[PDB]
Amino acid sequence: KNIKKGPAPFYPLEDGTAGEQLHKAMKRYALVPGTIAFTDAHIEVNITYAEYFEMSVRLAEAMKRYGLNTNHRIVVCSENSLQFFMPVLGALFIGVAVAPANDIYNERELLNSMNISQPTVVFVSKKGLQKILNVQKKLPIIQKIIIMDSKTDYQGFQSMYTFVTSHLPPGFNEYDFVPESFDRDKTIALIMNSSGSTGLPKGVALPHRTACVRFSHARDPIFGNQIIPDTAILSVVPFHHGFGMFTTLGYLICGFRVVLMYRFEEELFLRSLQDYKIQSALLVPTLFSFFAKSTLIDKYDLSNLHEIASGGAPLSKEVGEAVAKRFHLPGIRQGYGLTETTSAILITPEGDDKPGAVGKVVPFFEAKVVDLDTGKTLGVNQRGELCVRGPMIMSGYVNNPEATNALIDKDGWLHSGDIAYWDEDEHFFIVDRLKSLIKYKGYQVAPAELESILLQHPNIFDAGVAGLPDDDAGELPAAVVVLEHGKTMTEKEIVDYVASQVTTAKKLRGGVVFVDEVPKGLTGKLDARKIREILIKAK
Numbered sequence: 177k178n179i180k181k182g183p184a185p186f187y188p189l190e191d192g193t194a195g196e197q198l199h200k201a202m203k204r205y206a207l208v209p210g211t212i213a214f215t216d217a218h219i220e221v222n223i224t225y226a227e228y229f230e231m232s233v234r235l236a237e238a239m240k241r242y243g244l245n246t247n248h249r250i251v252v253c254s255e256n257s258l259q260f261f262m263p264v265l266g267a268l269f270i271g272v273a274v275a276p277a278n279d280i281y282n283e284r285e286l287l288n289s290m291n292i293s294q295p296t297v298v299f300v301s302k303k304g305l306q307k308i309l310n311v312q313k314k315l316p317i318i319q320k321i322i323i324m325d326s327k328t329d330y331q332g333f334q335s336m337y338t339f340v341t342s343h344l345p346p347g348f349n350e351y352d353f354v355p356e357s358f359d360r361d362k363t364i365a366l367i368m369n370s371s372g373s374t375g376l377p378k379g380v381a382l383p384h385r386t387a388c389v390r391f392s393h394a395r396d397p398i399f400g401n402q403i404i405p406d407t408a409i410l411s412v413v414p415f416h417h418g419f420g421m422f423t424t425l426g427y428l429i430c431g432f433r434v435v436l437m438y439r440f441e442e443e444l445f446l447r448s449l450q451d452y453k454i455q456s457a458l459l460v461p462t463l464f465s466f467f468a469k470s471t472l473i474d475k476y477d478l479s480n481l482h483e484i485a486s487g488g489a490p491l492s493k494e495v496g497e498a499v500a501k502r503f504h505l506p507g508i509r510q511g512y513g514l515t516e517t518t519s520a521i522l523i524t525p526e527g528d529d530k531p532g533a534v535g536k537v538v539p540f541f542e543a544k545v546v547d548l549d550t551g552k553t554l555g556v557n558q559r560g561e562l563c564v565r566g567p568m569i570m571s572g573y574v575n576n577p578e579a580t581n582a583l584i585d586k587d588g589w590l591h592s593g594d595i596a597y598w599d600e601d602e603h604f605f606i607v608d609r610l611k612s613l614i615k616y617k618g619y620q621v622a623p624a625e626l627e628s629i630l631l632q633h634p635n636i637f638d639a640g641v642a643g644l645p646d647d648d649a650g651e652l653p654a655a656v657v658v659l660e661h662g663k664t665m666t667e668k669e670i671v672d673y674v675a676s677q678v679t680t681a682k683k684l685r686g687g688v689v690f691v692d693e694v695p696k697g698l699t700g701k702l703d704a705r706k707i708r709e710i711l712i713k714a715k
């Protein structure tokens with residue numbers, strides 16, 4: 177009754193594995209000559225579905241022969257590049273699971289993912305190699321390091337191109353390759369690294385069944401992208417995380433041109449949007465503060481830009497709208513999701529933008545809000561913990577059944593750990609993450625509200641709210657702030673402005689600290705530890 181179910185899908189769940197469904201598709205677009213799969217903007221290099229389909233099939237077989245099967249895994253440890261999805265596609269076609277890694281990941285972070293992933297073959301960039309060499313000193317499961325962005329054998333490590341030849345038969349056809357068939361409910365497709373709530377990130381295991389459902393959404397005209405061939409998406413989302421991962425595997429399934437960047441550059445992004453004639457952009461919530469400013473957004477012709485999509489972190493109503501105006505759009509096609517749900521299970525329906533809302537329930541899903549204490553399902557406009565269930569939910573946490581039984585309850589409902597509510601026309605609204613909440617004098621103070629309000633001020637460029645520990649008060653809400661070039665506001669001006677918009681309960685009693693950039697988690701997300709350290713060193 178109060179259970180908000182998603183609709184029927186335009187494109188029903190197609191039979192076979194993620195690997196089989198991906199293959200079938202990239203053969204479609206490869207036999208069509210000239211079709212582009214990935215484009216590099218920094219170096220203006222294209223690469224066709226023929227070149228990609230082939231080099232992915234070559235790696236699939238090359239590995240198949242090397243001796244990997246459904247009882248093996250790998251690592252892909254690279255930043256956004258043309259090379260990244262070749263070994264991803266390779267692995268999915270034979271039933272080897274993939275564990276993406278963060279090129280920026282530090283030594284401990286990296287090791288923890290490796291120890292969980294237990295990778296047989298590790299794919300890495302020339303930048304990333306030396307961290308692998310360091311961590312492989314305690315990782316004896318690893319037999320092979322393969323350099324991704326190279327063509328000749330580098331420092332005794334093979335290239336993907338050399339690895340391929342030294343296993344592929346001389347007389348072999350890429351258009352004759354057949355992908356392995358298996359139990360997609362049982363066979364693990366991906367192993368995602370989480371934010372670990374507060375600790376060493378877990379092993380989020382995602383079956384082939386999940387990706388099969390993800391494709392059904394990406395082909396859906398309302399809940400994704402209408403399959404217009406030779407559409408060009410500009411992705412500036414880290415591929416290792418669910419957002420960049422599952423949006424791209426969807427785009428390959430539709431035959432779109434994925435334009436990508438290794439790092440953000442405001443100067444280029446718009447010229448990329450203009451020159452390549454981009455239809456959909458793929459920013460992360462934190463890049464929005466650079467565009468609500470003004471600058472060059474209508475000094476480049478963004479006439480083609482049909483929309484801007486966002487997720488993987490919160491976005492304030494007033495900043496999301498401020499950007500849609502500047503890009504000359506009806507809104508921001510937001511989405512919400514957990515890595516434990518593969519991809520976004522709440523997506524903004526096409527032509528159904530709702531400012532601060534993330535979106536309605538995607539097909540094959542059921543979303544509901546529960547009474548934080550009693551656990552009963554609440555009705556319209558009622559705030560509480562958001563619970564979701566459908567076929568994109570994880571199978572479990574790698575060697576961690578305890579945390580799995582604490583997140584996913586007995587009827588299969590995943591517990592988000594987020595305060596949400598659903599409005600009259602079923603748009604879902606995330607309030608705040610339950611652990612982000614600042615504890616004042618027995619009060620629950622949401623950082624998303626104080627952020628949303630601070631961000632409305634014209635002199636404020638960007639800001640992040642956190643809980644300065646006190647003693648008497650236990651925790652005072654305080655904010656790290658950024659201004660535009662040539663702007664000033666005294667702390668007391670900012671405080672008194674917050675105070676004039678909120679009750680005494682959630683005043684900014686911890687104060688303000690002025691920074692050049694807000695601690696960003698580089699997955700869109702705002703970093704709490706680094707803010708908490710900034711605020712704590714300032715008092």
Ligand SMILES: Nc1ncnc2c1ncn2[C@@H]1O[C@H](COS(=O)(=O)NC(=O)c2csc(/C=C/c3nc4ccc(O)cc4s3)n2)[C@@H](O)[C@H]1O
Binds near residue numbers: 488511523
């Ligand atoms: N839209 C949020 N609004 C508040 N918060 C959030 C939100 N999205 C993610 N958190 C925060 O992230 C927490 C979990 O972190 S997480 O494991 O890294 N999950 C993700 O962030 C995540 C993984 S995949 C994924 C999918 C992203 C998208 N995929 C698409 C595809 C199409 C499209 O139009 C939009 C999107 S958005 N998100 C959530 O519990 C919540 O606090």
